[PDB]
Design a protein around this ligand. Sequence first.
Ligand SMILES: [Zn+2]
Length: 37
Amino acid sequence: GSSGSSGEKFACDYCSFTCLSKGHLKVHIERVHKKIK
Ligand SMILES: [Zn+2]
């Protein structure tokens, strides 16, 4: 089997990142592609 998959997971709009939680996607965008101010 493959080392990664799309499955039923959420994906980043800016890079090749994926996660099972929408909260983890929000935290990824808010810290990696945007910042807290
Ligand atoms: Zn990303």
